[PDB]
Amino acid sequence: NKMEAKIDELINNDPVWSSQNESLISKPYNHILLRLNLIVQINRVMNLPKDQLAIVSQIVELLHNSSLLIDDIEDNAPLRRGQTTSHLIFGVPSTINTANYMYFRAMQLVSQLTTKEPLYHNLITIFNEELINLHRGQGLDIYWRDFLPEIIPTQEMYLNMVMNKTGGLFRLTLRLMEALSPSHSLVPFINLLGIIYQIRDDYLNLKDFQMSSEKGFAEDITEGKLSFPIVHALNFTKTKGQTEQHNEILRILLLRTSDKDIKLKLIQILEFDTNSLAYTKNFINQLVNMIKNDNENKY
Amino acid sequence: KNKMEAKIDELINNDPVWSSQNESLISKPYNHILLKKNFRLNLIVQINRVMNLPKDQLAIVSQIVELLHNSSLLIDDIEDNAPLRRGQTTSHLIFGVPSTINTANYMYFRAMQLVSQLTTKEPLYHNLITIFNEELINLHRGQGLDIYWRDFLPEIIPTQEMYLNMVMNKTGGLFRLTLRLMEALSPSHGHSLVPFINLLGIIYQIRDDYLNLKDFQMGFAEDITEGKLSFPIVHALNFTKTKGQTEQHNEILRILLLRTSDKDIKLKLIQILEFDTNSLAYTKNFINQLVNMIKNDNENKYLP
Ligand SMILES: CC(C)=CCC/C(C)=C/CC/C(C)=C/COP(=O)(O)OP(=O)(O)O
Ligand SMILES: CC(C)=CCC/C(C)=C/CC/C(C)=C/COP(=O)(O)OP(=O)(O)O
Ligand SMILES: [Mg+2]
Ligand SMILES: [Mg+2]
Ligand SMILES: [Mg+2]
Ligand SMILES: [Mg+2]
Incomplete structure (x- = not known):
């Protein structure tokens, strides 16, 4: 019963996830962290408020940096921006997962550009x-x-x-x-x-x-x-x-x-x-x- | 100078070109694992007994689940360096890691497009x-x-x-x-x-x-x-x-x-x-x- 109770709490809740964990799987991504100018130039024409432009910008950088983690696995690259590629350091497995993980984090930032359903x-x-x-x-x-x-x-x-x-x-x-x-x-x-x-x-x-x-x-x-x-x-x-x-x-x-x-x-x-x-x-x-x-x- | 500009012009003013033949090429890793359901579709059919969705809607949900599931296996196998998946040779050993990763990811978003055909009700x-x-x-x-x-x-x-x-x-x-x-x-x-x-x-x-x-x-x-x-x-x-x-x-x-x-x-x-x-x-x-x-x-x- 103590097991079945601990279990009942598990299944009756959101899946637990700490920032410790967030950190551990973001390693491939953080490593590549170690454009925009374009977004700014074009915004002179689109005239988006700074707050919204910032989000569009984070979204694109998230998809882009992630693309590189993947492309480097796909292209078998040893160097990106002058450093060892993430997959060579952390492995192909974590890098794929983290990169695909970031695609969805990016999708998740989209619901912050508007509150208007259409x-x-x-x-x-x-x-x-x-x-x-x-x-x-x-x-x-x-x-x-x-x-x-x-x-x-x-x-x-x-x-x-x-x-x-x-x-x-x-x-x-x-x-x-x-x-x-x-x-x-x-x-x-x-x-x-x-x-x-x-x-x-x-x-x-x-x-x-x-x-x-x-x-x-x-x-x-x-x-x-x-x-x-x-x-x-x-x-x-x-x-x-x-x-x-x-x-x-x-x-x-x-x-x-x-x-x-x-x-x-x-x-x-x-x-x-x-x-x-x-x-x-x-x-x-x-x-x-x-x-x-x-x-x-x-x- | 002149005819090359005419073609570039046509190219940039049109939606990106994509053929059915290209689709086949990009799907090879996927269609390969399809040669592997009535036990995933079974649970969906039983659970609909409680959800009662209109059949065609149920088919879409269904298609979405096959896509995510199957594409996740393509990637899990690369990630686990698995030589075999349900008896046959895994796709990455046949089509390569690159195409396999990309095809699986391509399916993730394909599955996501299916979601916006489950309803048009904005909320x-x-x-x-x-x-x-x-x-x-x-x-x-x-x-x-x-x-x-x-x-x-x-x-x-x-x-x-x-x-x-x-x-x-x-x-x-x-x-x-x-x-x-x-x-x-x-x-x-309930x-x-x-x-x-x-x-x-x-x-x-x-x-x-x-x-x-x-x-x-x-x-x-x-x-x-x-x-x-x-x-x-x-x-x-x-x-x-x-x-x-x-x-x-x-x-x-x-x-x-x-x-x-x-x-x-x-x-x-x-x-x-x-x-x-x-x-x-x-x-x-x-x-x-x-x-x-x-x-x-x-x-x-x-239980319900
Ligand atoms: C934006 C996004 C989420 C994409 C997901 C799919 C993906 C991995 C796309 C590749 C993007 C790209 C142009 C990479 C570099 O091209 P390249 O092969 O010439 O490599 P290089 O930049 O080193 O020249
Ligand atoms: C649903 C979806 C879009 C997933 C994409 C991400 C991904 C690679 C998920 C794997 C899910 C899973 C439990 C696989 C098998 O587990 P296992 O590691 O024990 O491997 P096995 O089932 O073949 O034994
Ligand atoms: Mg490349
Ligand atoms: Mg490339
Ligand atoms: Mg596995
Ligand atoms: Mg696994």
């Missing part, structure tokens, strides 16, 4: 839709990389995955803001910005290695990722009939090598053989021009 | 999202504490109480989630059945822990390989500690820390549990006491 309903739908999109882009990015060469994505395919994957968070922040704006839509512009952002990340990952084997590590090659330059090189070589080059590119990616000279041979293949690096640079300026060269404010 | 919908959000936070708290104890062993040796609060959260979360949504949707229903569903969740987990050691002794006893702080183990470790049985307490710990697949060694542990601590007999008596609170609930305190 408005709340739209913030949840937005949250849910963009998260579904983020996983869709990420899903494809991982599939192409891991089942290569089952699928050699074209430039258009890569661009759509980028819309979902990177455009996803950009759109979630904006759409939340537009829905809260007490005050055309900026989504298209934010979509373009996300694309510019992802192709630039892809680009610099290799450029900061071709210039200094101590500026970047061209980790993307190690991961075997189908970056923008890589997608350009694989299609270019197939189209120009460069079978050997096409195949050597695949081989190097499939190796998942940390060899600096092998990574540098691939970067130079993109440099002189396929001109993927020039192509990517020029593609980035063109995308930026669409913006800088918009006097009619269509963006 | 009610908020209670459904709160419930969903609340139980997923709890499930993750339980899961995180179970993983922590296992991966940090022997830093913290949980007590029985501790193991039970962890269970309320972990396993009880999906049970409560289902129940609470059903109850909030109910058109009818006292809340959460307490009963909580007790049901505890029985289920401990039963799971017990059977995993007992099906081996009679089941590969994977829980030993994983180094999991199960109910019998939590009992063996505290019992031995309390009896100042130093060398057995340590031998238990050495074996769990071996993360071994050696049947001889897994057996050496099961025997410490039978002959030294009697943890298996003790776990058995515990499940029985828990079930008796149900079989002897003439007052209908927990």
Whole structure:
């Protein structure tokens, strides 16, 4: 009976959870803690009170930092922001759980943006839709990389995955803001910005290695990722009939090598053989021009 | 310059592109575990006898539960480095850890979208999202504490109480989630059945822990390989500690820390549990006491 009593108290109450415990499972997340400027610039247009902007901001940082914990497991990364990745320190298991834990903490902050039922309903739908999109882009990015060469994505395919994957968070922040704006839509512009952002990340990952084997590590090659330059090189070589080059590119990616000279041979293949690096640079300026060269404010 | 801008223009002005083919690719890890219910759907069907939801609504709740459950297994298996799930090879060993994690997470939000099709009644919908959000936070708290104890062993040796609060959260979360949504949707229903569903969740987990050691002794006893702080183990470790049985307490710990697949060694542990601590007999008596609170609930305190 003393057991059955202690048990009756257990089941007739909320599940117990201390802050000691909160601390123990937040380890992976706190470690990565060791944007915004953008949210501020856009708010000049949305005019959200500071209190509400703060929450939108905490929400995005929670989803973002969490994404990195996961992406680093998925991409098998050893370094983020210059430190060892959380999963290498605390393990893949805790990191997955903590990161997924944070997704829901973020969802939980949404009920603090409003007390109005209809408005709340739209913030949840937005949250849910963009998260579904983020996983869709990420899903494809991982599939192409891991089942290569089952699928050699074209430039258009890569661009759509980028819309979902990177455009996803950009759109979630904006759409939340537009829905809260007490005050055309900026989504298209934010979509373009996300694309510019992802192709630039892809680009610099290799450029900061071709210039200094101590500026970047061209980790993307190690991961075997189908970056923008890589997608350009694989299609270019197939189209120009460069079978050997096409195949050597695949081989190097499939190796998942940390060899600096092998990574540098691939970067130079993109440099002189396929001109993927020039192509990517020029593609980035063109995308930026669409913006800088918009006097009619269509963006 | 000009045709490339035309295409980028079309691209950024449209919703993100997604095909049915892409959906198949992203679902492979999921559809793979589907080849594994009429016992999860059974309890839902019986409980509806008390909640009386319109069938199609009941189907949605149902679909939501298959998604969360199945996706949780995809992740638990990665998290527990399990080679087998219900007989076949786990998805992460076939499709890889990356796709598996992502596909399971993708399903979490798919399940969340289903929730907003259970009703459009603004008030009610908020209670459904709160419930969903609340139980997923709890499930993750339980899961995180179970993983922590296992991966940090022997830093913290949980007590029985501790193991039970962890269970309320972990396993009880999906049970409560289902129940609470059903109850909030109910058109009818007496006292809340959460307490009963909580007790049901505890029985289920401990039963799971017990059977995993007992099906081996009679089941590969994977829980030993994983180094999991199960109910019998939590009992063996505290019992031995309390009896100042130093060398057995340590031998238990050495074996769990071996993360071994050696049947001889897994057996050496099961025997410490039978002959030294009697943890298996003790776990058995515990499940029985828990079930008796149900079989002897003439007052209908927990039962409907
Ligand atoms: C926002 C959110 C909750 C997302 C959940 C799904 C998820 C893990 C998305 C990945 C987000 C992302 C763009 C990571 C970095 O991309 P990358 O692969 O190029 O990695 P890098 O930043 O190191 O270049
Ligand atoms: C419901 C949901 C969305 C969950 C997501 C988070 C997650 C990984 C939950 C696992 C829940 C659970 C009790 C799994 C099995 O327990 P176990 O560790 O004893 O493993 P086993 O049941 O295979 O023996
Ligand atoms: Mg990455
Ligand atoms: Mg990535
Ligand atoms: Mg498990
Ligand atoms: Mg587990």
